[PDB]
Amino acid sequence: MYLRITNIVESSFFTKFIIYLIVLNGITMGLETSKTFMQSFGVYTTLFNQIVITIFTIEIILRIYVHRISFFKDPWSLFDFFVVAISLVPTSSGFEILRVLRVLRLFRLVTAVPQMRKIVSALISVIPGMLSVIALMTLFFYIFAIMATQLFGERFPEWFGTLGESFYTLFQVMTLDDWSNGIVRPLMEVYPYAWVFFIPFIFVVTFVMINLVVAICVD
Amino acid sequence: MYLRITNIVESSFFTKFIIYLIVLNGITMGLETSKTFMQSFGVYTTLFNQIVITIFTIEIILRIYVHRISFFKDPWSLFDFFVVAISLVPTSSGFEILRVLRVLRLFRLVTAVPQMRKIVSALISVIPGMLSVIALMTLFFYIFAIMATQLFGERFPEWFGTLGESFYTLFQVMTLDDWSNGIVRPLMEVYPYAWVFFIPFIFVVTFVMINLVVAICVD
Amino acid sequence: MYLRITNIVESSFFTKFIIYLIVLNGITMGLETSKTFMQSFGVYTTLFNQIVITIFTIEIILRIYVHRISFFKDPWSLFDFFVVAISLVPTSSGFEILRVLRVLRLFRLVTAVPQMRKIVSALISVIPGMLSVIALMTLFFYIFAIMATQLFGERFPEWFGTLGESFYTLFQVMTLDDWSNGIVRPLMEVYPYAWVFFIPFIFVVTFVMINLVVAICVD
Amino acid sequence: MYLRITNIVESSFFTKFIIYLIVLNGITMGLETSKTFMQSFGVYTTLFNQIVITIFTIEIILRIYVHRISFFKDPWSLFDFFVVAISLVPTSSGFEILRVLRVLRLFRLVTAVPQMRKIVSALISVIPGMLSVIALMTLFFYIFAIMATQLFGERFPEWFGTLGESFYTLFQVMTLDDWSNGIVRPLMEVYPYAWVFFIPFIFVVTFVMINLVVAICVD
Ligand SMILES: [Ca+2]
Ligand SMILES: [Ca+2]
């Protein structure tokens, strides 16, 4: 029976049928957003919803008999498994995020289309050539986050009171978002020289980030 | 008479007479902005306006009897057609944006001049080699916009209350506009972990957006 | 006496004497900033100022004998004339900006030192290849600035009340400064659809500005 | 004994032992952040800290005999000296930044891993090409900061008023952070024309900053 189902699975119709469900399920989830619609046709939806999840487990079952180990060595295949997996966990217990993480299956539209796969892969492929710099910054954030936590966290515990909080605030300064009136101008009402910590922080981080951009505009 | 007018239409005079009118009506529209100027000379500029609107229809009419099918296959011409059409809809009824969309005619200075046309066309032509990315992002915004609506909509309806709202807020974070003090920090007073949703959303959206830019400098 | 002075002006010493004065007057103008310093050594620095302005007029006078009509055809040369001239206008009457515009002479340190000159020129040379785009946008701003004034200026005169105000506000959106909480979210409390004007406004203007930068990396 | 130690120091084990310390002292510093952790293991960590500081001075001493003059002509080595030196100052009176600057030793993880060194060096190497621009800008900032102080600092001393305050505010405008609502809109309530000073300032400073980025993407 193997070669029977291998022909079914590898069949263009099969793929296109899967893709069709995604674009239907995608549209369905955006409708699940309307509190009105759910009162009207929620039943219709949750069942259509459960159907797809059944169908998707079947597909993932089929997809593995026809690839075995070649499957679990495929990023795209793995993705799909782990996504449908999520959607499998019952509609209760644990963390209310699971019910919500279900919408991640809409990313299957990416996986089930090569043109998308192509673009994502083009994108991802740039990452390893960034890890040298990324690592550098992460070391950097970590060093300053620590300095900040012990320089400002006592008078300013919202922003710097904790290693995590300093990390967040330092990130915010890096995105340059409301950084002066929002953070440093205040900080300075107590610590006049805080500009000595943040202007340099800003130069370094902005400089590095520009280098990172030109680095990707060469490869 | 065909060749008589085909020789009038193609005439440098005719074309430069059009450009001359555009720059006048352009100037006249910035004057119509002034409450003071409209008092005293309202009728001047209202007549002068209706005058030009005729002249432009006459032209667009003449322009067709010379080009027929060729004219309804010229981007720049179709434009000119539709932009005059809008300017034709009676100063009443329906929507009042039509009185305001009439200012779109000043975009004719772009069509009716090659130097401008060159640059516009240059710009536009970059778009198709972005749609792969643009598609990806729209799918992404749609996914996260759904998650946000069903994670923050209840306590924060102004910002995430509706699928559209989340789209708006998500756009806003993407432009990095006032995103932390103002959206995420407030959010965190209730949802300590909201940072888990927004830092990743930001990395992705900004990474992708950098790629899209380096894409446009490899062409 | 011509050849005598053509050896005074063209000399190394002359030039390096001029440069020495600039860096001295420059330092002197940062000290004129302190109200303290002025209550002590203010007389010193006002004379020192008039002194330098004398010395500078002598030089520019000299410079013209040695160069005649060739001088008024050098960008850098014309500049120094204009800048020194501004510095000549009596410490009274008309506008006080003239007293303030005097500090523009410190731009002579650029005019009168190569490499600066080189770099400035490097930069300016990039401009003409932007004029097509620049022009394009200025038409675009103008069109929307008009549109906004008549869509939003009645309920929101601070921001869109005058054509000029719209230009300012529209500029501000383009710099993406506080555009959503500061301007559009408010606007929407009255004009729910205002998002239809600003998101498109923002795509266009951002897109364009990206191209203009990609252009400057082609040239 | 020279060649004995030159075989100890130059040894892989020596280096990898140093790296192993950094990553441990690094971890230990992120824990010294916790107020809880200090109340339980504070003594453990302060001793461990004093220890590592010795180990690093022993190393730095060893490192010097094996290299002599070649060491004080190595950037990376000098660094390690100064960084360790800072950590050497007696945890006591004087400034308190010295206790905080101690966390700078984690930058040794950069100095003592060739993969970091490379990337850092790759970055630093870009700086010389920028000094022509960097100089230009500093001159520019200096000129406008002075103008601003004498134009706006009487009514707006928080922001201007001091040559330094202007510098800061001008920096802020350049990062474009809250520049319109936060600064220029207010200024205009008193000085209607302040826009004539800040819009050009913004064009120029952002122009320059674009050219600088393009110059780095070509070298
Ligand atoms: Ca802001
Ligand atoms: Ca901002």
Coordinates of N, CA and C in Angstrom, one line a residue, chain C residues 13-211:
Chain C
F13 N 52.1 81.3 5.6 CA 51.9 82.0 6.9 C 50.6 82.6 7.0
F14 N 50.2 83.3 5.9 CA 48.9 84.0 5.8 C 47.7 83.1 6.2
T15 N 47.6 82.0 5.4 CA 46.6 81.0 5.5 C 46.6 80.5 6.9
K16 N 47.8 80.0 7.4 CA 47.8 79.4 8.7 C 47.6 80.5 9.8
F17 N 47.8 81.7 9.5 CA 47.4 82.8 10.4 C 45.9 82.9 10.5
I18 N 45.3 82.9 9.3 CA 43.8 82.9 9.2 C 43.2 81.8 10.0
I19 N 43.6 80.5 9.7 CA 43.2 79.4 10.4 C 43.3 79.5 12.0
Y20 N 44.5 80.0 12.4 CA 44.8 80.3 13.8 C 43.7 81.3 14.4
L21 N 43.3 82.2 13.6 CA 42.3 83.2 14.2 C 40.9 82.6 14.3
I22 N 40.5 81.9 13.3 CA 39.2 81.1 13.4 C 39.1 80.3 14.7
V23 N 40.1 79.4 14.9 CA 40.1 78.5 16.1 C 40.2 79.3 17.4
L24 N 40.6 80.5 17.2 CA 40.7 81.4 18.4 C 39.4 82.1 18.7
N25 N 38.8 82.6 17.6 CA 37.5 83.3 17.7 C 36.4 82.2 18.1
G26 N 36.6 81.0 17.5 CA 35.7 80.0 17.8 C 35.6 79.7 19.3
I27 N 36.8 79.5 19.9 CA 36.9 79.3 21.3 C 36.3 80.5 22.1
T28 N 36.6 81.7 21.5 CA 36.1 82.9 22.2 C 34.6 82.9 22.2
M29 N 33.9 82.4 21.2 CA 32.4 82.4 21.1 C 31.7 81.4 22.0
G30 N 32.4 80.3 22.4 CA 31.9 79.4 23.3 C 32.0 79.9 24.7
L31 N 32.9 80.9 24.9 CA 33.1 81.5 26.2 C 32.1 82.6 26.4
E32 N 31.7 83.2 25.3 CA 30.7 84.3 25.4 C 29.3 83.7 25.7
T33 N 29.2 82.4 25.7 CA 28.0 81.7 26.1 C 27.8 81.8 27.6
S34 N 28.9 81.8 28.4 CA 28.8 81.9 29.9 C 28.6 83.3 30.3
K35 N 27.4 83.5 31.0 CA 27.1 84.8 31.6 C 28.1 85.2 32.6
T36 N 28.7 84.2 33.3 CA 29.8 84.4 34.3 C 31.0 85.0 33.6
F37 N 31.5 84.2 32.6 CA 32.7 84.7 31.9 C 32.5 86.1 31.3
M38 N 31.3 86.4 31.0 CA 31.0 87.8 30.4 C 31.0 88.9 31.4
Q39 N 30.6 88.6 32.6 CA 30.7 89.6 33.7 C 32.1 89.8 34.2
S40 N 33.0 88.9 33.8 CA 34.4 89.1 34.1 C 35.1 89.7 32.9
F41 N 35.3 88.9 31.9 CA 36.2 89.2 30.7 C 35.4 89.6 29.5
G42 N 34.2 90.1 29.7 CA 33.4 90.4 28.5 C 34.0 91.5 27.6
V43 N 34.6 92.5 28.2 CA 35.2 93.6 27.5 C 36.3 93.0 26.6
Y44 N 37.2 92.2 27.2 CA 38.2 91.5 26.5 C 37.7 90.9 25.2
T45 N 36.6 90.1 25.3 CA 36.2 89.3 24.2 C 35.4 90.2 23.2
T46 N 34.8 91.3 23.6 CA 34.1 92.1 22.7 C 35.1 92.9 21.8
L47 N 36.2 93.4 22.4 CA 37.3 94.0 21.6 C 37.9 92.9 20.7
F48 N 38.4 91.8 21.3 CA 38.9 90.7 20.6 C 38.1 90.4 19.3
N49 N 36.8 90.4 19.5 CA 35.8 90.2 18.4 C 35.9 91.2 17.3
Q50 N 35.8 92.5 17.7 CA 35.9 93.6 16.7 C 37.2 93.5 16.0
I51 N 38.3 93.2 16.8 CA 39.6 93.0 16.3 C 39.6 92.0 15.1
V52 N 39.1 90.8 15.4 CA 39.1 89.8 14.4 C 38.3 90.2 13.2
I53 N 37.2 90.9 13.5 CA 36.3 91.3 12.3 C 37.0 92.3 11.5
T54 N 37.9 93.1 12.0 CA 38.7 94.0 11.3 C 39.7 93.2 10.4
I55 N 40.6 92.5 11.1 CA 41.6 91.6 10.5 C 40.9 90.8 9.3
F56 N 39.7 90.3 9.5 CA 39.0 89.5 8.5 C 38.6 90.3 7.3
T57 N 38.3 91.6 7.5 CA 37.8 92.5 6.4 C 39.1 92.9 5.6
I58 N 40.1 93.2 6.3 CA 41.4 93.4 5.6 C 41.8 92.2 4.7
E59 N 41.8 91.0 5.2 CA 42.1 89.8 4.5 C 41.1 89.7 3.2
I60 N 39.8 89.8 3.4 CA 38.9 89.6 2.3 C 39.2 90.7 1.3
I61 N 39.5 91.9 1.7 CA 39.9 93.0 0.8 C 41.1 92.7 0.0
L62 N 42.2 92.3 0.7 CA 43.4 91.8 0.1 C 43.1 90.7 -0.9
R63 N 42.4 89.6 -0.4 CA 42.1 88.5 -1.2 C 41.5 88.9 -2.6
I64 N 40.7 89.9 -2.7 CA 40.0 90.4 -3.9 C 41.0 91.0 -4.9
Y65 N 41.9 91.8 -4.4 CA 43.0 92.4 -5.3 C 43.7 91.3 -6.0
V66 N 44.3 90.4 -5.3 CA 45.0 89.2 -5.7 C 44.2 88.3 -6.6
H67 N 42.9 88.4 -6.8 CA 42.0 87.5 -7.5 C 41.0 88.1 -8.4
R68 N 40.6 89.3 -8.1 CA 39.6 90.1 -8.9 C 38.3 89.3 -9.2
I69 N 37.9 89.2 -10.5 CA 36.7 88.5 -10.9 C 36.7 87.0 -10.7
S70 N 37.9 86.5 -10.5 CA 38.1 85.0 -10.3 C 37.6 84.5 -8.9
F71 N 37.5 85.5 -8.0 CA 37.2 85.3 -6.6 C 35.6 85.1 -6.4
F72 N 34.9 86.0 -7.1 CA 33.5 86.0 -7.0 C 32.9 84.8 -7.9
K73 N 33.7 83.9 -8.2 CA 33.3 82.8 -9.0 C 33.7 81.5 -8.3
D74 N 34.3 81.7 -7.1 CA 34.6 80.5 -6.3 C 33.6 80.4 -5.2
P75 N 32.9 79.2 -5.1 CA 31.9 79.0 -4.0 C 32.5 79.5 -2.7
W76 N 33.6 78.8 -2.3 CA 34.3 79.0 -1.0 C 34.6 80.5 -0.7
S77 N 34.8 81.2 -1.8 CA 35.3 82.6 -1.6 C 34.1 83.5 -1.3
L78 N 33.1 83.3 -2.2 CA 31.8 84.1 -2.0 C 31.3 83.9 -0.6
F79 N 31.3 82.7 -0.1 CA 30.9 82.3 1.2 C 31.5 83.3 2.2
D80 N 32.8 83.3 2.3 CA 33.6 84.0 3.3 C 33.2 85.5 3.2
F81 N 32.9 86.0 2.0 CA 32.6 87.4 1.9 C 31.2 87.5 2.6
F82 N 30.2 86.8 2.2 CA 28.9 86.9 2.8 C 28.9 86.7 4.3
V83 N 29.7 85.7 4.8 CA 29.7 85.5 6.2 C 30.4 86.6 6.9
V84 N 31.5 87.1 6.4 CA 32.1 88.3 7.1 C 31.2 89.5 7.0
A85 N 30.5 89.7 5.9 CA 29.6 90.8 5.7 C 28.5 90.8 6.8
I86 N 27.9 89.7 7.0 CA 26.9 89.5 8.1 C 27.5 90.0 9.4
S87 N 28.8 89.7 9.6 CA 29.5 90.0 10.8 C 29.8 91.5 10.9
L88 N 29.6 92.2 9.8 CA 29.8 93.6 9.8 C 28.7 94.5 10.3
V89 N 27.4 94.1 9.9 CA 26.2 94.7 10.3 C 26.1 95.1 11.8
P90 N 26.0 96.4 12.0 CA 26.1 97.1 13.3 C 25.3 96.4 14.4
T91 N 25.9 96.3 15.6 CA 25.3 95.6 16.7 C 24.0 96.2 17.2
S92 N 23.1 96.5 16.3 CA 21.8 97.2 16.6 C 20.8 97.1 15.4
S93 N 19.6 97.6 15.6 CA 18.6 97.8 14.6 C 18.2 96.5 13.9
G94 N 17.1 96.6 13.0 CA 16.6 95.5 12.3 C 16.2 94.3 13.0
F95 N 17.0 93.2 12.9 CA 16.9 92.0 13.6 C 18.1 91.7 14.4
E96 N 18.0 90.9 15.5 CA 19.1 90.5 16.4 C 19.7 89.2 15.9
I97 N 19.0 88.6 15.0 CA 19.6 87.3 14.5 C 20.9 87.6 13.8
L98 N 21.0 88.8 13.3 CA 22.3 89.2 12.7 C 23.4 89.1 13.7
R99 N 23.1 89.5 14.9 CA 24.1 89.4 16.0 C 24.4 87.9 16.2
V100 N 23.4 87.1 16.0 CA 23.5 85.7 16.3 C 24.1 84.9 15.1
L101 N 23.7 85.4 13.9 CA 24.3 84.8 12.6 C 25.8 85.0 12.5
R102 N 26.4 85.9 13.2 CA 27.8 86.1 13.2 C 28.6 84.9 13.6
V103 N 28.0 84.0 14.3 CA 28.7 82.8 14.7 C 28.9 81.9 13.5
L104 N 28.2 82.2 12.4 CA 28.4 81.4 11.1 C 29.9 81.5 10.5
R105 N 30.6 82.5 11.0 CA 32.0 82.7 10.6 C 32.8 81.5 11.0
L106 N 32.4 80.8 12.0 CA 33.2 79.6 12.4 C 33.1 78.5 11.3
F107 N 32.2 78.8 10.3 CA 32.2 77.8 9.2 C 33.4 78.1 8.3
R108 N 34.1 79.1 8.5 CA 35.3 79.4 7.7 C 36.4 78.4 7.9
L109 N 36.4 77.8 9.1 CA 37.3 76.7 9.4 C 37.2 75.5 8.4
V110 N 36.0 75.4 7.8 CA 35.7 74.5 6.7 C 36.2 75.0 5.4
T111 N 35.9 76.3 5.2 CA 36.2 77.0 4.0 C 37.7 77.1 3.8
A112 N 38.5 77.2 4.9 CA 39.8 77.6 4.8 C 40.7 76.5 5.3
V113 N 40.3 75.2 5.1 CA 41.1 74.1 5.4 C 40.6 73.0 4.5
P114 N 41.5 72.5 3.6 CA 41.1 71.4 2.7 C 40.7 70.1 3.5
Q115 N 40.3 69.0 2.9 CA 39.8 67.8 3.5 C 38.4 68.1 4.1
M116 N 38.2 69.1 4.9 CA 36.9 69.7 5.3 C 36.3 70.0 3.9
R117 N 36.8 71.0 3.2 CA 36.5 71.4 1.8 C 36.3 70.2 1.0
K118 N 37.1 69.2 1.1 CA 37.0 68.0 0.3 C 35.7 67.3 0.6
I119 N 35.6 67.0 1.9 CA 34.4 66.3 2.5 C 33.1 67.0 2.2
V120 N 33.1 68.3 2.4 CA 31.9 69.1 2.1 C 31.5 69.0 0.7
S121 N 32.5 69.1 -0.1 CA 32.3 69.0 -1.6 C 31.8 67.6 -2.0
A122 N 32.4 66.6 -1.3 CA 32.0 65.3 -1.5 C 30.5 65.2 -1.3
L123 N 30.1 65.8 -0.2 CA 28.7 65.7 0.2 C 27.7 66.4 -0.8
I124 N 28.1 67.7 -1.0 CA 27.2 68.5 -1.9 C 27.0 67.9 -3.3
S125 N 28.1 67.3 -3.7 CA 28.1 66.7 -5.1 C 27.0 65.7 -5.2
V126 N 26.6 65.1 -4.1 CA 25.6 64.1 -4.1 C 24.2 64.7 -4.4
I127 N 24.1 66.0 -4.1 CA 22.8 66.6 -4.1 C 22.1 66.7 -5.5
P128 N 22.8 67.1 -6.5 CA 22.1 67.2 -7.8 C 21.5 65.9 -8.3
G129 N 22.1 64.8 -7.9 CA 21.5 63.5 -8.3 C 20.4 63.1 -7.4
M130 N 19.9 64.0 -6.6 CA 18.7 63.8 -5.7 C 17.6 64.8 -6.1
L131 N 17.9 65.8 -6.9 CA 16.9 66.8 -7.2 C 15.7 66.3 -7.9
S132 N 15.8 65.2 -8.7 CA 14.6 64.6 -9.3 C 13.6 64.1 -8.2
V133 N 14.2 63.3 -7.3 CA 13.4 62.8 -6.1 C 12.9 63.9 -5.2
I134 N 13.9 64.8 -4.7 CA 13.5 66.0 -3.9 C 12.3 66.7 -4.5
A135 N 12.3 67.0 -5.8 CA 11.3 67.7 -6.4 C 10.0 66.9 -6.3
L136 N 10.1 65.6 -6.6 CA 9.0 64.7 -6.5 C 8.2 64.9 -5.2
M137 N 9.0 64.7 -4.1 CA 8.4 64.8 -2.8 C 7.8 66.1 -2.4
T138 N 8.5 67.2 -2.7 CA 8.0 68.5 -2.5 C 6.6 68.7 -3.2
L139 N 6.4 68.0 -4.3 CA 5.1 68.1 -5.0 C 4.1 67.4 -4.1
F140 N 4.6 66.2 -3.6 CA 3.8 65.2 -2.8 C 3.4 65.8 -1.5
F141 N 4.4 66.4 -0.7 CA 4.1 67.1 0.5 C 3.0 68.2 0.2
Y142 N 3.3 69.0 -0.8 CA 2.3 70.1 -1.2 C 0.9 69.6 -1.4
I143 N 0.8 68.5 -2.1 CA -0.5 67.9 -2.4 C -1.3 67.5 -1.1
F144 N -0.6 66.7 -0.3 CA -1.1 66.3 1.0 C -1.3 67.4 2.0
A145 N -0.3 68.3 2.1 CA -0.4 69.5 3.0 C -1.7 70.2 2.6
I146 N -2.0 70.3 1.3 CA -3.3 71.0 1.0 C -4.4 70.1 1.5
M147 N -4.4 68.8 1.1 CA -5.5 67.9 1.5 C -5.8 67.9 3.0
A148 N -4.7 67.8 3.8 CA -4.9 67.8 5.2 C -5.5 69.1 5.7
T149 N -5.1 70.2 5.2 CA -5.6 71.5 5.7 C -7.1 71.5 5.5
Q150 N -7.6 70.9 4.5 CA -9.1 71.1 4.3 C -9.8 69.8 4.8
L151 N -9.0 68.8 5.2 CA -9.7 67.7 5.9 C -9.7 67.8 7.4
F152 N -8.7 68.4 8.0 CA -8.5 68.3 9.4 C -8.4 69.6 10.2
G153 N -8.3 70.7 9.5 CA -7.8 72.0 10.1 C -8.9 72.7 10.9
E154 N -10.2 72.3 10.7 CA -11.3 72.9 11.4 C -11.3 72.4 12.9
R155 N -11.2 71.1 13.0 CA -11.3 70.5 14.4 C -9.9 70.4 15.0
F156 N -8.9 70.6 14.2 CA -7.5 70.5 14.7 C -6.6 71.5 14.1
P157 N -6.9 72.8 14.4 CA -6.1 73.9 13.8 C -4.7 74.0 14.3
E158 N -4.3 73.5 15.5 CA -2.9 73.6 15.9 C -2.0 72.9 14.8
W159 N -2.5 71.8 14.3 CA -1.8 70.8 13.4 C -1.9 71.0 11.9
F160 N -3.1 71.3 11.5 CA -3.5 71.3 10.1 C -4.2 72.6 9.7
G161 N -4.2 73.6 10.6 CA -5.1 74.7 10.4 C -4.7 75.6 9.3
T162 N -3.4 75.7 9.0 CA -2.8 76.5 7.9 C -2.1 75.6 7.0
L163 N -1.9 75.9 5.7 CA -1.1 75.1 4.8 C 0.2 74.8 5.4
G164 N 0.8 75.9 6.0 CA 2.1 75.7 6.6 C 2.1 74.8 7.8
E165 N 1.1 74.9 8.6 CA 1.0 74.0 9.7 C 0.9 72.5 9.2
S166 N 0.1 72.2 8.2 CA 0.1 70.9 7.6 C 1.5 70.5 7.1
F167 N 2.2 71.4 6.6 CA 3.5 71.0 6.1 C 4.3 70.5 7.3
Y168 N 4.3 71.4 8.3 CA 5.1 71.0 9.6 C 4.6 69.7 10.2
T169 N 3.3 69.5 10.2 CA 2.8 68.3 10.8 C 3.2 67.1 10.0
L170 N 2.9 67.2 8.7 CA 3.3 66.2 7.7 C 4.8 65.9 7.7
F171 N 5.7 66.9 8.0 CA 7.1 66.6 8.1 C 7.3 65.8 9.2
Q172 N 6.6 66.1 10.3 CA 6.8 65.4 11.6 C 6.4 63.9 11.5
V173 N 5.3 63.6 10.9 CA 4.9 62.3 10.6 C 6.0 61.5 9.7
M174 N 6.6 62.3 8.8 CA 7.6 61.6 8.0 C 8.8 61.3 8.8
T175 N 9.2 62.1 9.8 CA 10.3 61.7 10.6 C 9.8 60.7 11.6
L176 N 8.6 60.3 11.4 CA 7.9 59.2 12.3 C 7.9 59.6 13.7
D177 N 8.0 60.9 14.0 CA 8.1 61.4 15.4 C 6.7 61.5 16.1
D178 N 6.5 60.6 17.0 CA 5.3 60.6 17.9 C 4.1 60.7 16.9
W179 N 4.1 60.1 15.8 CA 3.1 60.3 14.8 C 1.8 59.6 15.2
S180 N 1.8 58.5 15.8 CA 0.5 57.8 16.1 C -0.2 58.2 17.5
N181 N 0.4 58.1 18.6 CA -0.2 58.6 19.9 C -0.3 60.1 19.8
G182 N 0.8 60.8 19.3 CA 0.7 62.2 19.2 C -0.2 62.9 18.2
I183 N -0.5 62.2 17.1 CA -1.3 62.9 16.1 C -2.5 62.1 15.5
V184 N -2.2 60.9 15.1 CA -3.2 60.2 14.4 C -4.3 59.5 15.3
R185 N -3.9 59.0 16.4 CA -4.8 58.4 17.4 C -5.8 59.5 17.8
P186 N -5.3 60.8 18.1 CA -6.2 61.9 18.4 C -7.1 62.2 17.2
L187 N -6.5 62.4 16.0 CA -7.3 62.7 14.9 C -8.5 61.6 14.7
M188 N -8.2 60.4 15.1 CA -9.2 59.4 14.8 C -10.3 59.4 15.8
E189 N -10.1 60.0 16.9 CA -11.3 60.1 17.8 C -12.4 60.9 17.2
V190 N -12.1 61.7 16.1 CA -13.1 62.4 15.4 C -13.3 62.1 13.9
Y191 N -12.3 61.6 13.3 CA -12.2 61.2 12.0 C -11.7 59.8 12.0
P192 N -12.6 58.8 12.2 CA -12.2 57.4 12.4 C -11.3 57.0 11.2
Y193 N -11.5 57.5 10.0 CA -10.8 57.0 8.9 C -9.5 57.7 8.6
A194 N -9.1 58.6 9.4 CA -7.9 59.4 9.2 C -6.7 58.4 8.9
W195 N -6.8 57.2 9.4 CA -5.7 56.2 9.2 C -5.5 56.0 7.7
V196 N -6.6 56.1 6.9 CA -6.5 56.0 5.4 C -5.7 57.0 4.7
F197 N -5.6 58.2 5.4 CA -4.7 59.2 4.9 C -3.3 59.0 5.4
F198 N -3.0 58.8 6.6 CA -1.6 58.7 7.1 C -0.8 57.4 6.8
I199 N -1.4 56.2 7.0 CA -0.6 55.0 6.6 C -0.2 55.1 5.1
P200 N -1.1 55.3 4.2 CA -0.6 55.5 2.8 C 0.5 56.7 2.7
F201 N 0.2 57.8 3.3 CA 1.2 58.9 3.3 C 2.5 58.4 3.8
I202 N 2.5 57.5 4.7 CA 3.8 57.1 5.4 C 4.5 56.0 4.5
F203 N 3.8 55.1 4.0 CA 4.4 54.1 3.1 C 5.1 54.9 2.0
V204 N 4.4 55.7 1.2 CA 5.0 56.4 0.1 C 6.3 57.1 0.5
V205 N 6.2 57.9 1.5 CA 7.2 58.8 1.9 C 8.4 58.1 2.4
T206 N 8.2 57.0 3.1 CA 9.2 56.1 3.6 C 9.9 55.4 2.5
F207 N 9.1 54.8 1.6 CA 9.6 54.1 0.4 C 10.6 54.9 -0.4
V208 N 10.0 56.0 -0.8 CA 10.8 57.0 -1.6 C 12.1 57.3 -0.9
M209 N 12.0 57.6 0.4 CA 13.2 58.0 1.1 C 14.2 56.9 1.1
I210 N 13.8 55.6 1.0 CA 14.7 54.5 1.0 C 15.4 54.4 -0.4
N211 N 14.6 54.6 -1.4 CA 15.2 54.7 -2.8 C 16.3 55.8 -2.9

